[PDB]
Amino acid sequence: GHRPVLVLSQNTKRESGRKVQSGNINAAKTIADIIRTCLGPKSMMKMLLDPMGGIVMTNDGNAILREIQVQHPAAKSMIEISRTQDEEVGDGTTSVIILAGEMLSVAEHFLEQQMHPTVVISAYRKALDDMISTLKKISIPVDISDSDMMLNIINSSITTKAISRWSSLACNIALDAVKMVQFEENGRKEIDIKKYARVEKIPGGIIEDSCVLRGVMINKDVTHPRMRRYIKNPRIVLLDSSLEYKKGESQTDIEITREEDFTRILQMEEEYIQQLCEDIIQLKPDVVITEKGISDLAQHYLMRANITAIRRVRKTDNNRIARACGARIVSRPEELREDDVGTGAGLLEIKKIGDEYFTFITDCKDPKACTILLRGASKEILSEVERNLQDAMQVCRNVLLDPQLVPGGGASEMAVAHALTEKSKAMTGVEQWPYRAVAQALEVIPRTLIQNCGASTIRLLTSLRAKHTQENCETWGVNGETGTLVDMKELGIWEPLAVKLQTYKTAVETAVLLLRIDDIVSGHKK
């Protein structure tokens, strides 16, 4: 016997000192190196094996990072910041990771050179503030009324994905969807593309046939074949309550003693259904769409009035239809009003694609919701196309909200680095060295672009750095396709200011978070 006595429980480890900092920085560098080669217009794609047996062939950094599992907590923090960048702005996920990895890599030097992490953190925060100032300075305005400028911005956003082959069609689709989704009510502007901009993937066909509809498409068919599958100018009526006969909430029981009470009860059930159908018909609609089941007898009474019925649509699909055709979902048909009747859909067609029926409510006038019908080679191709379309729509929304633009291809990075170095020339304290280190660490984006392009990093980067020292060279970047220095006033690669601001903020703050950390303790039970 005599079991050992000790302060902390077993399986409780603890390491401290330079080892923890080095391990955290190495984990961040490994996370960066995982997706270092997936940046730029010449990025290669990666194939990821889902544990559930799926395959994710993707170029996006966030999907790659979220599809892998790590044990080191610093890698978990890096994945979390990647997800945060993806959610906040939409793109820039594989740039912020690289930036954070480089910043931690250059901070490791000062950590090893007897400098306390707090000084490094203060220098990092001053550098971040000056980066924000420089980006706000070098930005240019954009008028959202010019469709060509918006298309160019979306193209520059999607030149690095696999959809650059059909870039023109993709940009048109994304811009149209964002414009359709844009809404304002009660003075509250709203661009909510995660609910009212739906992407539907139907494998087969050709990618060139993909388009955005002026309406909503659902995978539903008429309840009864006698119903019309083609109505010219339908009057939409939406419901979210069953058209059947159902038990009440209170516990209720009948007690039948007379002979004719059973038939009377059944007849009153039928009459209740008939009354509901008559209440619906009194508005004289053309179709009825419900989120809950519709009884066969109700279907008969609806067909008697020449009304097409769709049985069970989802909540989100019903909301999209309401936004598109101008209807208003109601629960009790007794309280139906003419305002709730959905007029504005220019055509309702129920056609067959492949071996399945699909319902189209397209041709709407002024629709506030849309569906993007994607057709392609297979499921994974369509998934990647959908991810690229999400990136494009997020970029379009960011530009619509924040109409300033900054040069791409590392031109902004080099301009900010040069401005930071010029400002650091004036400081005299010990904080200047980490400040300049961050300034030059910001140059990783053009270096990675040159490395991915296959060109030589050293001389190209040196020439670019020399070029940025002149009076007006803030728009000089690199070609990701030819490996040459070009003015981005000519190449036309521009990025939203919000995306760059979010990227720099997230990278610097992740570096700050991982610099503060020491004395890792693990193994304790909840």
Binding site: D33, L49, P51, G53, I55
Partner: protein
């Protein structure tokens, strides 16, 4: 769609317990890291102090 097979050629012909590190990142950086670690272990015994 649940396992990544070894690439045909040298990867398959490699012995059971052997290891093969090739390229810059896999070999040169790892060797530099190991040498840095050794120097770090020995560093604190340098000089009169």
């Amino acid at each position: 769609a649940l396992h990544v097979p070894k690439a045909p050629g040298f990867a398959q012909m490699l012995k059971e317990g052997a290891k093969h590190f090739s390229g810059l990142e896999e070999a040169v950086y790892r060797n530099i890291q190991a040498c840095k670690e050794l120097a770090q272990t020995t560093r604190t015994a340098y000089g009169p102090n």
